[PDB]
């Protein structure tokens, strides 16, 4: 390149960030998904549809592990996800190299959000177009955080991204409670998944992973369809 370095993101005369505000829109236009943390671990479920019957399903994957006890999913545009995925892959590694121990979850939300925020303030590059969800049973109590294009993050007992995240938001507020178990939380998660899903909901129409205190794990289409009984 040449070294222009000048940031393309400035404050509005009103005092707003037009680019971040727009990127949040494309984030909202992404695929819906939700996760829950109930007293034993966390469950993550997405809204994965193949636009044609010629696609492969065992090729592309959404619920993605980072460490043996740390799972992550997203809502936005697919391609930008994988970059920051790999970045977090390395970033979790250097901690383990330094201290010889699995990095705590909150540290990852710290460093990743730092990378994204700095990347927002940097020059000549649009911010990302995906929000993220992270879960992990670090030291018994699992954790479930959310990032955003603005680099911010929170700690959610359970929430959902994608389309109609406010409708499924309220649905989570009502059907949800203080405490549950993993299977029940799966049941309600698929409940809100069918809340906006298409007609037929099969093992491939979605995909789900979980964190346990025994570590992070992904769910296979076998137990997916097996759990499809007692729908919603």
């Amino acid at each position: 390149e040449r070294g222009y370095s000048f940031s393309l993101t400035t404050f509005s005369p009103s005092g707003k960030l037009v680019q971040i505000e727009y990127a949040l829109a494309a984030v909202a236009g992404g695929a819906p998904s939700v996760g829950i943390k109930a007293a034993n671990g966390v469950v993550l479920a997405t809204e994965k549809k193949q636009k044609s019957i010629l696609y492969d399903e065992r090729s592309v994957h959404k619920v993605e592990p980072i460490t043996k006890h740390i799972g992550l999913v997203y809502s936005g545009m697919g391609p930008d996800y994988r970059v920051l995925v790999h970045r977090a892959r390395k970033l979790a590694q250097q901690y383990y190299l330094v201290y010889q121990e699995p990095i705590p979850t909150a540290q990852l939300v710290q460093r990743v959000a730092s990378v994204m925020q700095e990347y927002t303030q940097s020059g000549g590059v649009r911010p990302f177009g995906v929000s993220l969800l992270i879960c992990g049973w670090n030291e018994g109590r699992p954790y479930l955080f959310q990032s955003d294009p603005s680099g911010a993050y929170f700690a959610w007992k359970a929430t959902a991204m994608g389309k109609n995240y406010v409708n499924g938001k309220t649905f989570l507020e009502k059907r949800y409670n203080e405490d549950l178990e993993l299977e029940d939380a799966i049941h309600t998660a698929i409940l809100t998944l069918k809340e906006s899903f298409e007609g037929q909901m099969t093992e491939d129409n979605i995909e789900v992973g979980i964190c346990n205190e025994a570590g992070f794990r992904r769910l296979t289409p076998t137990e997916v369809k097996d759990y499809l009984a007692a729908i919603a």
Binding site: E1, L8, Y22, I53, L54, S59, R126
Partner: protein, 240 residues
């Protein structure tokens, strides 16, 4: 709508769009060509016609079937510049794989590298996004044949048989009704279907010279290009 320079650079629209890349997809359409790829039970085949409007224009210097490795074939669309420049990238990181890890690169992995590279072409706002398309095939151990499609947008996905060029919708329409009806796929099954879908979309009944056929099969993993003799053998083969 247009706001600021969303019409000019890689930024977001008020609707959350970006006009450049979607300008780029139809930028492949100026190539005036349509490609076809199919995976079989133990084989996968590529095929695509060519246009030789000149007698002075050589024949062997027109091929788009590009041998990447001894077990990796690929085909291109869009513009020849971006295609060829894509080529040395593919070959280059392909060899870098062998140097770093010893064994052979997975065809899916290489698609990962290419899509990731193409990611920045859209990501930075000071670089043209290389408006061409990518197609790969190759045999996998414990996995059989595989086919993938790399895009200027920077994403990919597996298939079972897929076409590209200018007639995406039509060829996909033909293939969907063609394959899903419990089709057992032999070698000449997949091949004959390959010639037939194209010759139906274009309504050609081509001479065996114009089209090109790449092939890989799990009896000789070497990526192989077809000779017009055998190609004619299959042509008359489907010619009842």
């Amino acid at each position: 709508s247009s706001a600021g320079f969303d019409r000019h650079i890689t930024i977001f629209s008020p609707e959350g769009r970006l006009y450049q890349v979607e300008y780029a997809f139809k930028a492949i359409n100026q190539g005036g060509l349509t490609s076809v790829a199919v995976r079989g039970k133990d084989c996968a085949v590529i095929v695509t016609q060519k246009k030789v409007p000149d007698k002075l224009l050589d024949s062997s210097t027109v091929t788009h079937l590009f041998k990447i490795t001894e077990n990796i074939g690929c085909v291109m669309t869009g513009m020849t510049a971006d295609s060829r420049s894509q080529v040395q990238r593919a070959r280059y990181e392909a060899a870098n794989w062998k140097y770093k890890y010893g064994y052979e690169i997975p065809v899916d992995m290489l698609c990962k590298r290419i899509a990731d590279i193409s990611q920045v072409y859209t990501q930075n706002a000071e670089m043209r996004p290389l408006g061409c398309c990518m197609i790969l095939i190759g045999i996998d151990e414990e996995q059989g044949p595989q086919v993938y499609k790399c895009d200027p947008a920077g994403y990919y996905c597996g298939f079972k048989a897929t076409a590209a060029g200018v007639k995406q919708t039509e060829s996909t329409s033909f293939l969907e009704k063609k394959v899903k009806k419990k089709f057992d796929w032999t070698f000449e099954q997949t091949v004959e279907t390959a010639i037939t879908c194209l010759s139906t979309v274009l309504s050609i009944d081509f001479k065996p010279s114009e089209i090109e056929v790449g092939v890989v099969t799990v009896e000789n993993p070497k990526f192989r290009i077809l000779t017009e003799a055998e190609i004619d053998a299959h042509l008359v083969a489907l010619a009842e």
